[PDB]
């Protein structure tokens, strides 16, 4: 069960993720700072999820069911069509395809550990960012 309100405890390689997607330095710096203490709300009902991630300047709300395509944005803010699957019991993986144009291959994963941590990974081609959260 991923449901709850989550707070960040670790972040690794976020600014570089943005950098390889081409994000300019002014915007990268604003984004990393804005996301340093995010609010993440998840409501899980079986395979149905609601995930709201808020930084100081942005809020994103996704609604999806595992196995059903949905629209979101890439981490750099480009609209995409996404599809989540269960890789294993505690771990979901998301493939993203841009709605318009082409770009680096992006994806994300979310997994719950036995100690109750939520691990988010985000990838752009060969660059990986890892963020870890715990429940409030
Ligand atoms: Na790369």
UniProtKB/Swiss-Prot annotation:
Result of altering residue 29 to A: Loss of ligand-induced nuclear import
Chain residue numbers at which the record places covalent cross-link Glycyl lysine isopeptide (Lys-Gly) (interchain with G-Cter in SUMO): 100
This protein's record includes keyword Glycoprotein: no
Keyword Transmembrane: no
Subcellular location: Cytoplasm; Endoplasmic reticulum; Nucleus
Inducing stimuli: By retinoic acid.
Consequence of changing residue 28 to A: Loss of ligand-induced nuclear import
Impact upon substituting residue 19 to A: Loss of ligand-induced nuclear import
Motif Nuclear localization signal, residue range(s) on this chain: 19-29
Taxonomy, superkingdom: Eukaryota
SUPFAM superfamilies: Lipocalins
Molecular functions per Gene Ontology: cyclin binding; fatty acid binding; retinal binding; retinoic acid binding; retinoid binding; retinol binding
Modification(s) after translation: Sumoylated in response to retinoic acid binding, sumoylation is critical for dissociation from ER and subsequent nuclear translocation.
Main location: cytoplasm
Residues reported to bind all-trans-retinoate: 131-133
One Pfam short name: Lipocalin
GO process annotations (BP): embryonic forelimb morphogenesis; epidermis development; fatty acid transport; positive regulation of collateral sprouting; regulation of DNA-templated transcription; retinoic acid metabolic process; signal transduction
GO cellular component, one term: nucleus
Function: Transports retinoic acid to the nucleus. Regulates the access of retinoic acid to the nuclear retinoic acid receptors.
PANTHER family registered for this protein in UniProt: FATTY ACID BINDING PROTEIN (PTHR11955)
This protein's domain notes: Forms a beta-barrel structure that accommodates hydrophobic ligands in its interior.
Assembly behavior: Interacts with RXR and RARA. Interacts with importin alpha.
Family listed: Belongs to the calycin superfamily. Fatty-acid binding protein (FABP) family.
Protein name, per record: Cellular retinoic acid-binding protein 2
Organism: Homo sapiens
């Amino acid at each position: 069960n991923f449901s709850g309100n989550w707070k960040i405890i670790r972040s690794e390689n976020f600014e570089e993720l943005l950098k390889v997607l081409g994000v300019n330095v002014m915007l990268r710096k604003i984004a990393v700072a804005a996301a340093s203490k995010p609010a993440v709300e998840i409501k899980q009902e079986g395979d149905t999820f609601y995930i709201k991630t808020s930084t100081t300047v942005r809020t994103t709300e996704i609604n999806f069911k595992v196995g059903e395509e949905f629209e979101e944005q890439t981490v750099d803010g480009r609209p995409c069509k996404s599809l989540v699957k269960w890789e294993s019991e505690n771990k979901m993986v998301c493939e993203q395809k841009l709605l318009k144009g082409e770009g680096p291959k992006t994806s994300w994963t979310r997994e719950l550990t036995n100690d109750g941590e939520l691990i988010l990974t985000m990838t752009a081609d060969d660059v990986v960012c890892t963020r870890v959260y715990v429940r409030e």
